[PDB]
Copies of this chain bind each other. A is one copy, B any other.
Amino acid sequence: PQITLWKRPFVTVKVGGQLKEALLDTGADNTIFEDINLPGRWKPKMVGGIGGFLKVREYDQVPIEIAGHKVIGTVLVGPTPVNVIGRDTMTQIGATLNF
């Protein structure tokens, strides 16, 4: 649908099998979740951080659905204050910014 920005743009997402709230974040390149149980095959990911490598897993072949749109994407699992839907998943979903 169509979202104004008075509230943070949290949306309900079905990721893998599970329902989570995630923020649509046009400033973020990737889609990251924390606190999650993906059944997928994951691979480790190298992400440089303060004090060394952050603990970050990558899941491909992830069913993602937001507002009826069902897609297969890539989800990073790592430390993040909220779940974020970055531009990688927004573009697969035809999301535009309007003004």
Contact = CB atoms under 8 A, between A and B. Distances in A.
A13 B42 CA distance: 40
Interface of A: 1-6, 8-9, 23-29, 49-52, 66-67, 69, 79, 81, 84, 87, 90-91, 93-99
A29 B8 contact: yes
Contacts of A6: 87, 91
Contacts of A8: 27, 29, 87
Contacts of A24: 26-27, 97, 99
Count identical subunits in the complex. Answer: 2
Contacts of A29: 8
B5 A26 contact: yes
